[PDB]
Amino acid sequence: IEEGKLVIWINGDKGYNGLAEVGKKFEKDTGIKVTVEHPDKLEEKFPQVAATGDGPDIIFWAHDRFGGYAQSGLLAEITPDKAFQDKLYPFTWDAVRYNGKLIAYPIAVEALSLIYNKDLLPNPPKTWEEIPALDKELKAKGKSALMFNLQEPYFTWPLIAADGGYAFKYENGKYDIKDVGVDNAGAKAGLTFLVDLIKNKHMNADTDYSIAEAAFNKGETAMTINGPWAWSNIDTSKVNYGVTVLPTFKGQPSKPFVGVLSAGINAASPNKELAKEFLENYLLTDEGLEAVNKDKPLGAVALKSYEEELAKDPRIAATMENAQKGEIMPNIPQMSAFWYAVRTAVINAASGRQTVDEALKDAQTNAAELNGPLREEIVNFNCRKLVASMPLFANADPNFVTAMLTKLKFEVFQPGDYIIREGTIGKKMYFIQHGVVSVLTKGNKEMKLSDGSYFGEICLLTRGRRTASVRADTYCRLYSLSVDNFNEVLEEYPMMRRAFETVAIDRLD
Ligand SMILES: OC[C@H]1O[C@H](O[C@H]2[C@H](O)[C@@H](O)[C@@H](O)O[C@@H]2CO)[C@H](O)[C@@H](O)[C@@H]1O
């Protein structure tokens, strides 16, 4: 971030080129440059980087992650006046409330639908249960019935929820965080049906977003499950598609988790006023949303004036029908733990790492018990110890140490793994969070290092070989810090760079 410009983050499946057009209009009027970026794992990156001088001015995501960001102090309260508020649907404003405060601008309402190829399947099935029979019929003609993203639990959730699965029980206007529904009869039946699809070769566990998109848009599968954003690429592929009600499971509708694409203002931004002006006066207008919608459809927009037009589209009416059979996602801080829990369970069940019963038992405990803030805190202090213990960093500015912590990468090694091999060239030093290693120098004396220690640091000043091998003696958990990332932070703190250069200037004598 820098004062006088806007950096916006939005997910790579959304209309980021269209948003950049809105930004080009903004720059033309104010001289303020707008850069739109779509980094991978943006929703996880944002809370890591936002405090530490990095991060976008504006973050776009579904509202479910914003309670967490709000809890962490990473979002500015927004202050639209009543007239502006009246422009958007009251339920969209509700979705972005935390402690009664508005913490983001709602943009669009998202739900998943069944997308079907009308040439391959003129009458799409009404039930999940008839998909195996349909796939066998299609397999004989070199096709498949259904492919969709099995790596993201968002896509499998409607099935899980259909017969009674739920995230957190809603009662008397509030979520009971101790009452998780991911291990109940309904959730187990849903995921069992999905795993049986996999086991009987009607779907593949490795299927991700790209695979399913490419299969449906090339005409290889009769159906997919996706949201409005995906419709552009299907239009471009020329497939004759319909958008309809998701299939029923055990006679019960699929229950997609409804998301409200929302735009938050990073509390670290020096551009909060410019961010408000862009969001209120440029993006949230008929012209602004249209530019984004034209690139990748937004869904049912929060802006009433524009939604009046979009609601005439039967694809948007199918989206809202699915949405009404679903549930608005909670925005509570525990949602991150929930998603992490269900993601691992679905991946483990589908692959056969665990049974459905085992995977979901562990998901229940993870979603209910896991304390993100507490675990984050413990992880951050321990990393801070490791980095600040090293002689080089022993008297450095605490913010320098803090920026450096964000660069650390988690690595694991098995007994007998060489972390560093003598004669090779590395670009990383290592800190030992947990484990024992041997430092071996050809023939010689071993030296054993353990929890708290470090090694490989000479790559910070060498551009040269590894002069010793380092072998894991037990299971090791390490953090690595690369010379590039070290330099990058060292450039952000010029007083430290000068100190370290004067050190190196004397190390030549
Ligand atoms: O898979 C869990 C994931 O679900 C939701 O993410 C959606 C997102 O809302 C959509 O806009 C679209 O981009 O696809 C994502 C699924 O890959 C939740 O918003 C997210 O927090 C959660 O991790």
Take residue 455 and report the two structure tokens written for it. 């090694």
CA atoms of 11 and 140, how far apart (whole Å) = 38
Q: Is 327 in the pocket of ligand 1 (CB under 6 A)?
A: no
CA atoms of 166 and 185, how far apart (whole Å) = 11
Dihedrals φ, ψ of 418, to 5°? Answer: -80, 115
CA atoms of 392 and 188, how far apart (whole Å) = 53
CA atoms of 83 and 289, how far apart (whole Å) = 19
Report helix, strand or coil for 505.
Answer: helix
Query: Within the chain, what is the greatest distance between any pair of CA atoms?
Result: 82
Class of domain 375-507: mainly beta
CA of 468 to the centre of ligand 1 (A): 45
Please spell the DSSP secondary structure of 219-283, one letter per residue.
Answer: TSEEEEEE-GGGHHHHHHHT--EEEEPPPBBTTBPP-PEEEEEEEEEBTT-S-HHHHHHHIIIII
CA atoms of 296 and 328, how far apart (whole Å) = 22
CA of 44 to the centre of ligand 1 (A): 12
Dihedrals φ, ψ of 367, to 5°? Answer: -60, -35
Q: Is 62 in the pocket of ligand 1 (CB under 6 A)?
A: yes
Take residue 344 and report the two structure tokens written for it. 């691992």
> Quick one: which of 253, 228, 251, 266 has its CA closest to 58?
266
CA 95, 96, 99, 101 torsion-angle sign: negative
Cβ count within 10 A of residue 442: 9
Contact 221, 144 (CB under 8 A): yes
Contact 228, 297 (CB under 8 A): yes
The residue whose CA has the least distance to atom 17 of ligand 1 is: 152
Contact 74, 50 (CB under 8 A): yes
Describe the crossing of helices 286-295 and 16-30 by its angle, rounded to 10 degrees.
Answer: 140
Cβ count within 10 A of residue 496: 17
Q: Please report, in range form, the residues annotated as the binding site for 3',5'-cyclic AMP.
A: 456-457, 459, 466-467, 507
> Quick one: which of 265, 275, 260 has its CA closest to 75?
265
Half-sphere exposure of 376 (CA within 13 A, CB side): 11
Q: At which residue do the structure tokens 């809603």 appear?
A: 170
Q: Is 259 in the pocket of ligand 1 (CB under 6 A)?
A: yes
Task: State the DSSP code for 483.
Answer: H
Q: Is 208 in the pocket of ligand 1 (CB under 6 A)?
A: no
Alpha carbon 444 to its chain centroid, in Å, reads: 48
Beta bridge partners of 437: 449, 472
Report helix, strand or coil for 55.
Answer: coil
Alpha-carbon distances of 352 from 108, 158, 204, 367, rounded to whole Å: 37, 21, 12, 21
CA of 352 to the centre of ligand 1 (A): 24
The H or E element spanning position 373 is: helix 372-389
Residue type, 456: G
Q: Is 110 in the pocket of ligand 1 (CB under 6 A)?
A: yes
Report helix, strand or coil for 1.
Answer: coil
In degrees, rounded to 5, the angle at the alpha carbon of residue 392 between the alpha carbons of residues 388 and 395 is 60
Burial class (CB in 10 A: 0-12, 13-18, 19+), 482: middle
Instruction: Write the Ramachandran bin of 299: left for phi over 0, alpha for psi from -120 to 50, otherwise beta.
Output: left
Best mutation site among 46, 154, 262 for ligand 1 pocket (most ligand atoms within 8 Å of CB)? 154
Please spell the DSSP secondary structure of 381-429, one letter per residue.
Answer: HHHHHHHHHSGGGTTS-HHHHHHHHTT-EEEEE-TT-EEE-TTS---EE
CA atoms of 96 and 323, how far apart (whole Å) = 17
Q: Is 124 in the pocket of ligand 1 (CB under 6 A)?
A: no
Take residue 260 and report the two structure tokens written for it. 């409200």
Contact 108, 300 (CB under 8 A): yes
The H or E element spanning position 6 is: strand 6-9
Q: Is 213 in the pocket of ligand 1 (CB under 6 A)?
A: no
Residue type, 352: G
Rg (CA), the chain: 26
Best mutation site among 9, 109, 152 for ligand 1 pocket (most ligand atoms within 8 Å of CB)? 152
Q: At which residue do the structure tokens 């091999």 appear?
A: 421
Q: Is 65 in the pocket of ligand 1 (CB under 6 A)?
A: yes
Contact 470, 455 (CB under 8 A): yes
Q: Please report, in range form, the residues annotated as the binding site.
A: 456-457, 459, 466-467, 507
- Method used experimentally: X-ray
Contact 159, 249 (CB under 8 A): yes
> Quick one: which of 54, 77, 67 has its CA closest to 268?
54
Dihedrals φ, ψ of 185, to 5°? Answer: -55, -40
